[PDB]
Every structure is written in C-alpha cells, then in structure tokens.
Design a binder for this molecule. Structure first.
Ligand SMILES: O[n+]1ccccc1S
Ligand SMILES: [Zn+2]
Length: 257
C-alpha cells in the first residue's frame, strides 16, 4: 500500500488515490507576501482543558496520539471555523536531518518537523461522516524548529522506545496537548486536504505562524522509530512528509497584520 520511499512514496499515491492530483490538496507553500490579513476572521479558540488522550500507536507511517472524542472535551472553534470541531488525534511529520521534515513550508522554508492536531466537525456526528464533507475537518498545524527542549513534548519522546515498530501501541493517557502549543495563535488558513492517503479534501487548515522549539535530542528520538514491523529489516522512520502541492485557485488568509 503506501509510504514515503522511492517505490511507494508521494509520487505514487495518485494511482490508488486519484484525488492526489485534485484541486484542494495539502500541504502547500505559504507565500507570506501573497497571504492577506483577513479582519473578519473571528478569534481562534483552542479549548483543551478536558482532553482525554487514549493511546499512542506506530502505524508504520508515523505515530498517532489518539483521543476520546465521544463528547466536546477538547475542541477547536473560532477563527475561520463555523461550529465546533472535536480533537481526535495528533501526529507528526519529520525529517532525516533538521533542514527538512515539515509538510507546509513558509516562503519555501522547510522546518524540522510539523505537528498536526486533527479535529472533526461535530455537526456530522462522527469522523467517518465528517470526511465526506468539504468542511468536515480542521487541522491545527504547528512547525517545529531545533533549539531548546519542549517540556510538554518530552512525555511523547520517552514513550517512543516502546512503540519502535509498526503495529505497536502503548497506553498514553493523561497527556495534555496544551503543552505542544507556542505562545502565539497567529495563523494562516486555507482549504485543503489530508496530507496522507486517502488525501480527502475535507480540511480547513490553520497553520500557526510561530514554531515551537524542540531539542536536537528530542528530534533524534523521533528518528529512531521504524517504518517496518517487529523483527523485519530496519528502515528508520524519517522523511515521512508529503511535499508542497499546487495551490490552484486558493487563497491563504492571515489572522494577523
Ligand atoms: O497525518 N495524519 C494522519 C491521519 C489523519 C490526519 C493526519 S494530519
Ligand atoms: Zn499529519
């Protein structure tokens, strides 16, 4: 099926997932001199006080931290969004070296990694129905750069040794995703898609301007995970990012002047 290698990577995905070449694919390059401030954006509201994380899972593509989305416990509202979106999971994408790894770029700059907090629109009842809608998902994207350690990421780093290979999972309760945010909620927004197969075109992207800083030792640990399963040839889980896609007839809006 699909991956990030020469033989099954992003340039192959269109064959099983033809929407790969669609009109609202992600990620994109954010050209900061083309994005216009939109003063009608409502303030962004990140409400993660009652977040209930369940489990962390190496899916052979990246790792996912999964949440209880049965009720309005961790939600994203405001900004470009109408209604209420419930947090279902977060995941990351990263590089083999610090000069690549993010999916979105900013003025062609690649960051060392990119975190996605994925939410679905409660008006559609469940995630599977939300991904049949053009406004079904909102993904909060956050860039990582290498500098000082991010304390709130360390509980993730230290569990990685227990989920080295594809198919492994671990309990991951009581994790507070507020610790992954930067200071500022300044953002860019545009309509796009999931950046992983099935590439569905259902996402309102909200990409924070301010990166978070993680230490070299934190990112090094992400690069010790494996794409392969237990006892198979080791293929380090690195460069699990899709490159920028054509912007087509889309507008990127800035929340800030
Ligand atoms: O990378 N990723 C995996 C699953 C669904 C959403 C996202 S952002
Ligand atoms: Zn993602």
């Amino acid at each position: 099926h699909w991956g990030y290698g020469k033989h099954n990577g992003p340039e192959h995905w269109h064959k099983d997932f033809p929407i790969a070449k669609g009109e609202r694919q992600s990620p994109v390059d954010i050209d900061t001199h083309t994005a216009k401030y939109d003063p009608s954006l409502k303030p962004l509201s990140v409400s993660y006080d009652q977040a209930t994380s369940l489990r962390i899972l190496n899916n052979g593509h990246a790792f996912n931290v999964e949440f209880d989305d049965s009720q309005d416990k961790a939600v994203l509202k405001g900004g470009p969004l109408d209604g209420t979106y419930r947090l279902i999971q977060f995941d990351f994408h990263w590089g083999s070296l610090d000069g690549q790894g993010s999916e979105h770029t900013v003025d062609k700059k690649k960051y060392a990694a990119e975190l996605h907090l994925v939410h679905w629109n409660t008006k559609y009842g469940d995630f599977g129905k939300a991904v049949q809608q053009p406004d079904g998902l909102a993904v909060l994207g956050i860039f990582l750069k290498v500098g000082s350690a991010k304390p709130g990421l360390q509980k993730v780093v230290d569990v990685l040794d227990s989920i080295k290979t594809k198919g492994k999972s671990a309990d991951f309760t009581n994790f507070d995703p507020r610790g992954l945010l930067p200071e500022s909620l300044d953002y860019w927004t545009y309509p796009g898609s999931l950046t992983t197969p099935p590439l569905l075109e259902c996402v309102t992207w909200i990409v924070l301007k301010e990166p978070i800083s993680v230490s070299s030792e934190q990112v090094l640990k992400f690069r010790k995970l494996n794409f392969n399963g237990e006892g198979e040839p080791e293929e380090l889980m690195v460069d699990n990012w899709r490159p920028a896609q054509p912007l087509k007839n889309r507008q990127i809006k800035a929340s800030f002047k």
